[PDB]
Design a protein around this ligand. Structure first.
Ligand SMILES: CS(=O)(=O)N[C@@H]1CCOc2ccccc21
Length: 435
């Protein structure tokens, strides 16, 4: 595995012990062989779990999710997938790691796809070794993989809205349930319904993940309503997974806008990861998995692969060369390598719109490629009337940095900036010049 020029895919089933058993073994061997090593966690919650599994070993934790006093002589760095990609984009120097380990190497966020592309290109070049750890590698057709104990799989109609009758089996359960919903807004409705019926509900999403996940250990709950974020190593002490089998897909229409299409079928990798939450205790067989639809390869034409190409086109590799996407996922986008390469000033704007502006990659690229400086927010108000952002069936309004009251009408419309109350609130602050 550790020998150069090689990319290994560690494809053990969910719960096989890739993070607590296999990962420390690789770390010990890497330290023994003096290989400068990077460990890539998908989220800060997995980083905290990796610290527990690697406790004692000399690892430099490049995250505030862990409170450790470093000796300064560690040759193994641990950071999130997005931190790795972010530091690659910024002027800061990143070591040319001899060994690159990616946990949950199935994560389809644009920064995870970009990191895989960068690492795999370095391996293809014969510069480094890499290990991609995942139960569901890119290209998996099995939604029912092995587990530590048997799982009862049941195809059933799963409600995607509040209900008065017809789904007795959902509330007539005395155990703990993790329920995957296609969106935050869809989860709010089902959560309000379960709460009204006397259930204790915790809700998880990308923006509230670290805070609310802690509640699943600190308090007694009946249901956990989550988006696809819990597919990335999140572990619960539950006996049932209710899976709508649906997700929202960002799609770039005619290269002019981004809409959130669907809800539509999840990939086999996602369905397997969602099912993978239960059947993890070999001493407690019989965990249930209720699924409400089929799988399809909805990652083809998904905006994240185009966005990954926008990140890689702006990461230095060697002179004019540009990193390719990891081979099993390179056909999910019809992009020309190098087409999103920006000049130095616009690239600096692109990076800042993502890091500080917190804008989606596609939106940041449209603003930076137009030659607009980071603090220039006039574009948030000069788009056509069909780009009017709506809040509560009425146009959203903001006070500009000039003190004028204006309707939010962005020149480039990206549905992710107003997909929920929290996203819209952050976009309003950005359009007003608050960050
Ligand atoms: C994220 S932090 O505040 O905990 N600092 C970490 C740990 C020490 O090593 C490094 C190196 C570079 C950058 C961040 C860090």
């Amino acid at each position: 595995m550790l020998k150069k020029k090689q990319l290994t895919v560690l494809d053990l089933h969910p719960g096989a012990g890739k993070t607590r058993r296999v990962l420390p073994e690789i770390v010990r061997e890497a330290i023994k062989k003096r290989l400068r090593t990077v460990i890539l966690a998908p989220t800060r919650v997995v980083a905290a779990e990796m610290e527990e599994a690697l406790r004692g070993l000399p690892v430099r934790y490049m995250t505030t999710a862990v409170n450790v006093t470093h000796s300064g002589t560690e040759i193994v760095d641990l950071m999130c997938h997005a931190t790795f990609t972010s530091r690659l984009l910024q002027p800061i120097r990143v070591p040319n790691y001899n060994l690159n380990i990616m946990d949950e190497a199935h994560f389809t966020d644009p920064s995870s796809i970009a990191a895989r592309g960068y690492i795999s290109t370095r391996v293809e070049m014969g510069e480094a070794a890499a290990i991609f750890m995942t139960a569901t590698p890119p290209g998996t057709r099995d939604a029912f993989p092995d587990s530590n104990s048997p799982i009862m799989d049941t195809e059933v109609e799963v409600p995607e809205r509040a209900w008065s009758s017809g789904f007795d089996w959902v509330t007539d359960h005395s155990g703990k349930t993790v329920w995957f919903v296609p969106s935050v807004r869809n989860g709010n409705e089902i959560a309000a319904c379960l709460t009204k019926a006397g259930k204790r509900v915790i809700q998880l999403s990308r923006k509230t993940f670290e805070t609310e996940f802690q509640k699943t250990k600190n308090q007694e709950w009946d249901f956990v309503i989550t988006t696809d974020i819990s597919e990335m190593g999140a572990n619960f002490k539950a006996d049932r997974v209710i899976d709508s089998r649906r997700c929202l897909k960002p799609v770039i229409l005619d290269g002019e806008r981004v809409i959130l299409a669907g809800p539509m079928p999840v990939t086999h990798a996602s369905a397997a990861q969602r099912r993978g939450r239960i059947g993890r205790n070999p001493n407690k067989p019989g965990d249930e998995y209720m699924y409400g639809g089929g799988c399809a390869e909805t990652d083809e034409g998904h905006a994240h692969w185009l966005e990954a190409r926008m990140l890689l086109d702006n990461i230095y590799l060697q002179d004019g060369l540009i990193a390719s996407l990891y081979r099993p996922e390179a056909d999910k986008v019809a992009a020309i390598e190098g087409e999103f390469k920006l000049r130095t000033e616009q690239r600096k704007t692109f990076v800042e719109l993502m890091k500080r502006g917190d804008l989606p990659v596609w939106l940041a690229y449209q603003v930076a490629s137009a030659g607009i400086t980071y603090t220039d927010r006039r574009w948030c108000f000069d788009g056509t009337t069909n780009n009017t952002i709506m809040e509560d069936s009425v146009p959203a309004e903001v006070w500009t940095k000039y003190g004028e009251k204006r309707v939010l009408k962005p020149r480039w419309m990206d549905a992710r900036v107003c997909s929920d109350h929290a996203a819209l609130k952050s976009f309003k602050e950005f359009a007003a010049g608050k960050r």
